[PDB]
Amino acid sequence: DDRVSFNSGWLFSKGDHIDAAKSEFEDSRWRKLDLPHDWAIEGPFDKAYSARNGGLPVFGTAWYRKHFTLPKSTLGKSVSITFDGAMSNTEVFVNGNKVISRPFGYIAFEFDITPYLNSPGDENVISVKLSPENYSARWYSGAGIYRNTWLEINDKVHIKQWETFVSTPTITKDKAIVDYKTTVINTEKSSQPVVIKTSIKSAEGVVVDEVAQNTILPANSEHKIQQQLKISQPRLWDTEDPYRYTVVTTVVKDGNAVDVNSVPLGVRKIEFKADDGFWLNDRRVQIQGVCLHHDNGPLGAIVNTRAIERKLEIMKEMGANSVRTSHNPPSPELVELADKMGILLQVEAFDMWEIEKPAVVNGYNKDFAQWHDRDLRDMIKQYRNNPSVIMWSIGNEVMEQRKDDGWKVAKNLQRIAHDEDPTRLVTNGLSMYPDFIDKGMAQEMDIVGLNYKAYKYQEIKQAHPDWIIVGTETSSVVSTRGVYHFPIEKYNKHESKYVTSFDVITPPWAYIPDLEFENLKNNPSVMGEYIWTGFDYIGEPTPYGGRDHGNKFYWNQDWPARSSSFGAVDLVGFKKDRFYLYQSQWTKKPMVHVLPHWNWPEKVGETIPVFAYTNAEEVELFVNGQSKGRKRKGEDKVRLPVSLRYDKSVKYFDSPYRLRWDVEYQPGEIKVVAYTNDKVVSVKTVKTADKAAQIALFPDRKILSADGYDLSYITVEITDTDGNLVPDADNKINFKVEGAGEIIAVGNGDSATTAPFQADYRHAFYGKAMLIVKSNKGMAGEIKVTASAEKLISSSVVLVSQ
Ligand SMILES: OC[C@H]1CNC[C@@H](O)[C@H]1O
């Protein structure tokens, strides 16, 4: 029967608890909460925790406990529990019996609890112990049961979870052939004659094909099944049409369906051409991808369907069409949303392999030898049916790149992926030049994944023509929303602990996106890129605190810098100037964007740089009505400083992807006019804002589901009387939520603050703050949101829960 959520009614408590694995245990005073849950985001921030991991308590022992009772109708039934993810080093007990011991924190695991249950109707206790260690992550991991949990009651004859595998070996205009595999389990102590039905269902519920198999299952047995079906005139899954079928497996026993298993099916042709990029359904699709870490800003590492959906919507708005799950298996909700939103996925399994990355002594390296096979296979088993997945990845910047025998591990890992999923190619984030060429790791990979090697694309492709190449990790330029430093120079750090939004500051291994656009244009055989990153994430405050490839783990010299600056948007999804630069390269809808803002009272009469990003042909800049020149994109190049790790002769790059003026600052307004074919196609005006005066609220969604999980992201802006955003506003805004909802978190994208994420107040960060309102489960009605700040006009908005 169909599973239910197991998230409700848990107990939680930090520290060591001897005897907490036993049913009889004094947990009466333990804190009550529902899952998913991430205790590290609750803080507080402490300088004793490395800013590389966000300066939050992402390690230490903690326990979860849940009391649950099953109906008396569960007698003679199978009962299984699935944890989609637990961070990290998880041990699970059922009525004192140990059932799970899984170190990997990004993988889903399932465990049969039928042998350990008490009698139907009597209470059961499940105990979860997590023991994450310090010095184990290069970014913020969070801590706790951060992914959803599930309980399923099944017939003793049922389909094994994650063993159903479907693919399309042959696709023509007339038909698609569907290869099928499944495993049925018979946990009965006698033989069971059953019929295993396998149906392909359209979205409208039409059985477009069906086969069956009469079989006698031996007692306490497993039976593998292979079938082949046909879909006539199949509606393809595509970036422009994410249509999916459904494969339904039914265990029929004595004429009655006793178990029903469903998996998704997307019909699409994938082809990787070594000299012509990536092809989807017989046409080339340029990979315009972004890397994302798993956390959700103020929500921490917890999964939330709406938060993930919102991130994918904002990345698609930027023009992105692909996501790389850096550097770990994603939640099932992310992959499900990517299926329905037509987003191509590169699902990555590991960060490091067995050799530790510098100063990360407690990472996955300690478990790699024992767990790499099961963890890699389980990631593939869980997501091989999702049509959004177009390739697997086995690692990222692994230390084995400079080992003589490092290629053997890559070959062995790739062999495991090919065995579990023979239908997809495998890539790997290569970074140590020229080691990954000299020592043969790149030779072993299906797809050569290059990290920050754009200026080497031509040389590498000419020496190895038959290689399939992608930029697995590109740029890594950093910036802070609303921050501008003058003059535009390539410094290393700033006193403000923020980075200029003119997008020129790069770590020694990094470069500006212009250099990636240029080398992707000059080497069209490369299928595309995955930028680092699409969203800001907690931890790795580079250039502050430290650099990833150093041998020092504590990054607290620049405290309280604890969040990243690699993102094209900030921690809550506010668009940086970087967002519009990528929109100028990845979208076709006419747009124009200008930076910086026009509030510089200490610059009257002085010269100031002005940048314009557009996908149009020309842009003319106006300052208080006076034209400052009509520039032509691609012809009037912008000289920007660079510093390339493996090419020290290059000091500057003349980018044809930006436009620059240098004008005298006078308060008033600026305006950019975008021209294509000598006619106006886009206009953007930015006025000098007056004194801060009022609050403006912008909910992205006003209609929410009353499920207790749906969220509304309410943009909070500090403006003047005319509504112009005050670029430097830092007012403390107070929030009140009445009705069928409540505050769940707040943020503002500030990378160097210790302000709480769980509070009813938040400072504006360069004019903007974010209030996350959550629905309440089972109560529908109005949700009234009020924002207040002293010396400003308050604001109110009304939402509705259904
Ligand atoms: O520029 C920072 C990136 C370097 N490459 C690995 C990523 O996870 C991240 O640390």
Mutate to test the pocket of ligand 1, among 139, 432, 476, 530 (most ligand atoms within 8 A of CB): 476
At 419 the three-state DSSP class reads helix
* Domain chopping of the chain, boundaries: 4-154, 159-265, 281-474+508-539+565-586, 592-687, 694-801
Q: Is the CB of 476 under 6 A from ligand 1?
A: yes
| Cis amide linkage into residue 667, ω under 30° from 0 | no
The CA-atom distances, in angstroms, between 132 and each of 31, 82, 102, 105, 704 are 20, 20, 12, 9, 35
The neighbouring-strand residues paired with 193 are: 216
Please, are residues 142 and 75 in contact by the beta-carbon 8 Å criterion? no
Q: 281-474+508-539+565-586 is classed in which CATH architecture? A: Alpha-Beta Barrel (3.20)
User: Do the first three CATH levels of 592-687 and 694-801 match, i.e. the same topology?
Assistant: yes
The matching CATH number, chosen from 3.30.230.10, 1.10.3720.10, 2.60.40.10, 3.40.50.720, for 694-801 is: 2.60.40.10
* 591-614 burial code (b ≥16 CB/10 A, e <16): bbbbbbbbbbeeeeeeebbbbbbb
Q: Which atom of ligand 1 is nearest to the CA of 540?
A: 10
| For helices 513-522 and 577-586, angle between their N-to-C axes, nearest 10 degrees | 10
| CATH class of the domain defined by 159-265 | mainly beta
Q: Is the CB of 548 under 6 A from ligand 1?
A: yes
Q: Is the CB of 506 under 6 A from ligand 1?
A: no
| Torsional class of 749: left (φ above 0), alpha (ψ -120 to 50), beta (otherwise) | left
Degrees, nearest 5: CA angle 74-77-82: 95
**Residue 141: which of 59, 44, 34 has the closest Cα?**
59
Other CB atoms within 10 Å distance of the CB of residue 714 = 24
Q: Which atom of ligand 1 is nearest to the CA of 327?
A: 8
Quote the CA–CA distance of 347 and 427 in Å, as a whole number: 10
592-687 has which fold? Answer: Immunoglobulin-like (2.60.40)
Quote the CA–CA distance of 526 and 389 in Å, as a whole number: 19
Secondary structure string (H, E, C) spanning 552-599? CCCCCCCCCCCECCCCCECCCCCECHHHHHHHHHHCCCCCEEEECCCC
Nearest CA to ligand 1 atom 1: 476
Q: Is the CB of 348 under 6 A from ligand 1?
A: no
Q: Is the CB of 645 under 6 A from ligand 1?
A: no
Q: Is the CB of 472 under 6 A from ligand 1?
A: no
Tokens found for residue 631:
């520039």
Please, are residues 399 and 355 in contact by the beta-carbon 8 Å criterion? yes
Quote the CA–CA distance of 166 and 263 in Å, as a whole number: 8
At 537 the three-state DSSP class reads coil
Nearest CA to ligand 1 atom 9: 548
DSSP at 317: H
Positive or negative CA dihedral for 282, 396, 266, 160? positive
Parallel/antiparallel/unpaired status of strands 389-396 and 344-348: parallel
Parallel/antiparallel/unpaired status of strands 90-94 and 97-102: antiparallel
Tell me the CATH number for domain 4-154.
2.60.120.260
Residues 6+ apart with CB under 8 A from 28: none
Resolution number, Å: 2.4
The residue assigned the tokens 């903007």 is: 768
Active site residues: 397, 473
